[PDB]
Ligand binder design. Structure first.
Ligand SMILES: O=c1ccn([C@@H]2C[C@H](O)[C@@H](COP(=O)(O)O)O2)c(=O)[nH]1
Ligand SMILES: O=c1ccn([C@@H]2C[C@H](O)[C@@H](COP(=O)(O)O)O2)c(=O)[nH]1
Lengths: 316, 316
């Protein structure tokens, strides 16, 4: 059944995982070095044992393919995955005349009244990124985020490199290259980044007419994050393959520190008693070929029948 | 037996490998996505089924740990692995008043008299890098090579970052980081590099007092190159662990395109009939703790009993 590598990765951390402290005041069960492999010709590896919001994945990947780093687009697409990073920047600066708000995400966990104070402050900031252009330009732009690492890597000489654009031209003219790599890790910037990229690097490969992609993810949250992560990069492999007139082959997910937070152990156990169902089919618009101009309506997910969502706390 | 992941990787390419053309006018059997794992507490994974020159590995790693990019040090250590890249630069420029020499490495394969002409031209250039300081400074310095990617990553602001130095300080103060990464891939430079780094990135991990390291190697020559590659990074894991007062745990080798050249198939088959022998022991100098000042005499390889070397052509 296609999602079995995930169930086996999760069962495996459950049984071999060494406890490890981490960042958040919440510990983890961790393993280092793991690789799973998904044959994208048998289906689209969106999980059927819990509901994953495919709309969120889809608009986030498009924001990256457009080389965009401003939250105004995700918000227009009802997507709020990157909000708090933008919000954090608002609250550490000069027009933020407002309530106590530092340590806010953790505080919301065991929040006083504070949770609706944070959540209406947040709804303020967001409405404003949507409607005040100059605000959006200043507190809505996250800067160094996947869209710019992938499509506007800044050089020493003050210019910008479109890593991804170029690798697509390389797949087109030189399919057999072993240099079809894109990277989000920049030595210069990760010293003072909020979150250095978890999806550090990925490599493309063409053989027998099929395109495959291998991702190196330095760090992964098995429960909350990996279901999204598998789906963003399986989507990218379909998208780049379409654009190059290639067939899809495998997605290979390689892990550095794969971890399960200590407050997610019941929910993963919960999920591990579900039987997988047949995999959804991805359908891509036949008329459009430039993936940089794909649009939500051009990506169709067919026949997805998940088990109910499982809710779990974001550990901080 | 410790080297079994290699024998199984080679047997596996032999049986699943899809033929693929490549760069050199010599084809390959290739696989994409592979990970093997070596428990460095059971021995040092230098191969016993063929003789690997451990002195060469050892001086090459030291040249990188010194952040050096000039061939004068390797030559002083009788090591010539990087010669041709330096030589290639000599021959494409102005003082090279000498014979026909372009396409030289391939031509040597089916060389006329040319092989001793190349090999004495080469012995000229090398004696000169050794003795003429200004020559060494100009045609002996390769530039962008592991020593500088690791220890003097050039920033936009014209300065230099010692990625490796810093990750060792991070292992010392924050062992549980998931950001202990070093990278040799630079978007800016790989457009016009001779050879973009094969060993693209590696990640460190500390748990239960042991240090582990995972390497992402985009491209590998199973026969000639991977025996060296396993040994350079198993050496680095011992060396950084010593320097941090840590015990050694695993080396995990992740592959992008793993390939076997078509003119190495008898020799790998040849090797696959040898039985492995017990693994050598690495012994490191107890008095020295700063690995940046390690020296050949401080690294001891104990009890290595290889099978004879197997000679095979460098494919070009
Ligand atoms: O699958 C994913 C990928 C990323 N993150 C990350 C990585 C860690 O789980 C967390 C904190 O970042 P680091 O400490 O790992 O750098 O955010 C997830 O939550 N899930
Ligand atoms: O194990 C190793 C590592 C590197 N190289 C490389 C990579 C390819 O085998 C060859 C050419 O470089 P690329 O075309 O792969 O970039 O030199 C090897 O020969 N063996």
């Amino acid at each position: 059944m296609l999602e079995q590598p995930y169930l086996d990765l999760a069962k495996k951390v459950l049984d071999e995982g060494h406890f490890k402290p981490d960042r958040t005041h919440t510990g983890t069960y961790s393993i280092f070095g793991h690789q799973m492999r998904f044959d994208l010709s048998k289906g689209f590896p969106l999980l059927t044992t819990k509901k994953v919001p495919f709309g969120l994945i889809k608009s986030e990947l498009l924001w990256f393919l457009h080389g965009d780093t401003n939250i105004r687009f995700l918000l227009q697409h009802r997507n709020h995955i990157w909000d708090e990073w933008a919000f954090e920047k608002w609250v550490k600066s000069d027009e933020y005349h407002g309530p106590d708000m530092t340590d806010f995400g953790h505080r919301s966990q065991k929040d006083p009244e504070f949770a609706a104070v944070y959540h209406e402050e947040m709804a303020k900031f967001d409405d404003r990124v949507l409607h005040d252009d100059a605000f959006a330009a200043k507190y809505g732009d996250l800067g160094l985020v996947y869209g710019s690492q992938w499509r506007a890597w800044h050089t020493s000489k003050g210019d910008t490199i479109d890593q991804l654009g170029d690798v697509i031209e390389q797949i087109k003219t030189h399919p057999y290259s072993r240099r079809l790599i894109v990277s989000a890790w920049n030595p210069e910037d990760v010293p003072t980044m909020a979150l250095p990229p978890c999806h550090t690097l990925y490599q493309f490969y063409v053989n027998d007419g099929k395109l495959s992609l291998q991702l190196y993810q330095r760090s992964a949250d098995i429960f909350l994050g990996v279901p999204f992560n598998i789906a963003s990069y399986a989507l990218l492999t379909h998208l780049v393959a379409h654009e190059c007139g290639l067939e899809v082959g495998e997605f290979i997910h390689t892990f550095g520190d794969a971890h399960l937070y200590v407050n997610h152990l019941d929910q993963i156990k919960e999920q591990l008693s579900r039987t997988p169902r047949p995999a959804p089919t991805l359908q891509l618009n036949p008329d459009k070929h430039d993936i940089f101009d794909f649009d939500m309506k051009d990506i169709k997910l067919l026949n997805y029948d998940p088990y109910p969502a499982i809710k779990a706390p974001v550990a901080v």
